[PDB]
Design a protein around this ligand. Sequence first.
Ligand SMILES: CCCCCCCC(=O)SCCNC(=O)CCNC(=O)[C@H](O)C(C)(C)COP(=O)(O)OP(=O)(O)OC[C@H]1O[C@@H](n2cnc3c(N)ncnc32)[C@H](O)[C@@H]1OP(=O)(O)O
Ligand SMILES: CCCCCCCC(=O)SCCNC(=O)CCNC(=O)[C@H](O)C(C)(C)COP(=O)(O)OP(=O)(O)OC[C@H]1O[C@@H](n2cnc3c(N)ncnc32)[C@H](O)[C@@H]1OP(=O)(O)O
Ligand code: NA
Ligand code: NA
Lengths: 358, 358
Amino acid sequence: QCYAEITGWGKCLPPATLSNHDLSTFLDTSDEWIQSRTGIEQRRISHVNTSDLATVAAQHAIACAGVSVEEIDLIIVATCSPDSLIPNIASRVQQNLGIPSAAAFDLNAAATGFLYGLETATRLMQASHYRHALVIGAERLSFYLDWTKRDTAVLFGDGAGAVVLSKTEQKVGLQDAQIGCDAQGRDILAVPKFGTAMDRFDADNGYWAFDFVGKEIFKRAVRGMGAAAQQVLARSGLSTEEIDVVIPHQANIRIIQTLCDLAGIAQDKAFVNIHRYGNTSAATVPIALCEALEQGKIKPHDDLLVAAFGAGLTWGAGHIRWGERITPLGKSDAQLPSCDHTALDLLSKAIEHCKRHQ
Amino acid sequence: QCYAEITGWGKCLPPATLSNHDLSTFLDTSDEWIQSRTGIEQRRISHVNTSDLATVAAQHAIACAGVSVEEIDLIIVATCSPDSLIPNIASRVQQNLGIPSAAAFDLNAAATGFLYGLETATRLMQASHYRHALVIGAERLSFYLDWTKRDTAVLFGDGAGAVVLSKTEQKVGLQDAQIGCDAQGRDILAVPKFGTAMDRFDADNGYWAFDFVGKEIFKRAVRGMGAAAQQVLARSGLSTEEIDVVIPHQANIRIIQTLCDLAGIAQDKAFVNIHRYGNTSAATVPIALCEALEQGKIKPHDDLLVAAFGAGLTWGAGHIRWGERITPLGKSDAQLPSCDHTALDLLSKAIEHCKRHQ
Ligand SMILES: CCCCCCCC(=O)SCCNC(=O)CCNC(=O)[C@H](O)C(C)(C)COP(=O)(O)OP(=O)(O)OC[C@H]1O[C@@H](n2cnc3c(N)ncnc32)[C@H](O)[C@@H]1OP(=O)(O)O
Ligand SMILES: CCCCCCCC(=O)SCCNC(=O)CCNC(=O)[C@H](O)C(C)(C)COP(=O)(O)OP(=O)(O)OC[C@H]1O[C@@H](n2cnc3c(N)ncnc32)[C@H](O)[C@@H]1OP(=O)(O)O
Ligand code: NA
Ligand code: NA
């Protein structure tokens, strides 16, 4: 029996910050509403493409793991905002870092995609000949947003997180996972007209609907994640008190609290950074894991519960058993190109077109 | 030790057919050039979205396997032309067929994506609790094409293929596989400006370049596939004479012939249907497998070699050991909505815009 230890962790958050106050400047909303309903105070807006955020997060995770590029056998980028469809952006990350040979693909399961990626890489490694893997959740969700619609415009941000996995005999990394999808929730969270369903030559094709039914999402998410978390704990013989840390998707602070409350997990076990970054979809979990490690929230040998959901409606949970090391082997000087523009400056063209079309 | 038997197979080719003669009607090309250089005589153009082609192929594979929707635990759609990015289209296929619960994701590794999907589902099933899986290669490549540029406009078509996998103790299905990516070939085959790298509000954003360096692709593809096929055969203890059938990606007939020639595999072992459908990217392999089965090309207990490449430049090979059954359990009456339009009629809006912009 082999296992896939999380030997490296890393993040990349773009510098330009869109505050709740900044959103109040061009929308009928407030810090008071956004903060009390969602827990979000700020989020980051990328001046660079999704693959660039991915690459930097990967660079940090690679130094953290001390793994050479020659040893990386698999690259998975979990994203729903890739630079290109042809080719995939896993191959761009591969190109940027000079990784020869590795299998490289993009995985789309919306915000659950990192957990899907961790599950997928772990089983690939357990069943076949992949020595080390790079799994990245990376998003530039700001691409998609409708800057007239306050319901969604205030919820999402940009960023990336990465892990490196290393094959081992030790019983560490992802243990049981349960991933799934509630396809009856497919239409409640959707941008149906970006992709090959859109009219390529219509000049109004940029003004797509972001469909979003918050109450219905909340309900299906809590059920999806909750039942997945229960299957993981039940199958693994864990009592709930044995869970040391929860690393949840950062969609809404109330969803995190409800998940923990219904499962009987203490609220202070959940790592929350949604106030800083908002919902970064596939990046939420690996960024939260990275920061949990950075801030001393995870001890050697801890049991972690990861839980996530997203458009689909995809869902999942998993149990990670941490090994010996919670400290990086090395640091990276990798950074995004500098940018002195505000988040408002970056969104100007997009905001002005959306408001003019209305 | 478990294995993932291919218990179901199925295809969906849209009816509207673009002949080489039809391409001669609006481009400086000929049947004589296209047929002798590529082997392509016809290809299909979809009147429906990628998810619809996927669904029908899935329906045929499900009846072929005799598996209920309740038993399907995993859905992978390999595609680079999804209807939507949010949500994924694996979840649409899931919705269409009423499959509850299953993990559902889109996998993007261009034409190698089906092989990536087969590898991924097989290892998921071997290492964890997935009883049956649905793996689909589905594409509407006609969305992307530059109807002024003859180099690429004549090469690609639309379609989908599916398999159903069933967990078993018997040593059948995918055995060894070797998948990878040659990221130094990333820029030779690319549509860099469809995705989040495109300017959403530019009215000319629909007139994207399809970058394509045929000679360089040919060379990297032959090397990529060839070395992957060698690693598969070497690791598995197979002599080349023991390979009964080759199911190759249908990009170019000369690439198939060169692959077989350099490996010392007899040319008549390769199944070729590129003359009918062209390059359908991720759909090529599962459609060719489905048709090989339909036409009596595969016997019980045969050894198959699958080989593929695509944008990335992704590559791979695998060895499938066939089990007992080469005949479907049941048939499906599932079909696409009727369409009496020609391929030319369907492409009219796209062709007229491309030619007017030039
Ligand atoms: C671009 C990337 C997209 C792809 C994403 C992929 C990743 C994912 O899928 S993760 C998906 C994220 N999921 C979530 O955020 C969870 C969904 N749930 C929620 O957000 C919550 O239900 C939430 C906060 C909206 C509920 O708020 P609620 O309790 O209804 O507040 P309440 O006091 O009742 O007021 C509601 C009203 O406020 C108003 N309102 C909405 N937005 C705002 C705003 N920004 N400012 C002021 N008022 C607002 C509306 O009129 C709303 O009415 P209704 O609820 O009928 O639409
Ligand atoms: C939407 C799709 C997105 C992609 C999704 C992912 C799928 C994949 O990644 S699979 C990729 C598929 N790969 C391929 O098709 C590669 C196959 N190989 C080739 O294309 C060959 O090299 C091929 C067909 C060009 C043959 O070359 P070859 O016979 O050696 O050269 P030759 O006989 O001199 O002809 C080439 C010349 O013909 C001309 N020519 C090109 N197209 C045409 C045409 N349609 N009609 C007439 N002449 C043409 C060109 O001037 C070309 O010049 P150059 O020498 O500069 O390339
Ligand atoms: Na514990
Ligand atoms: Na044989």
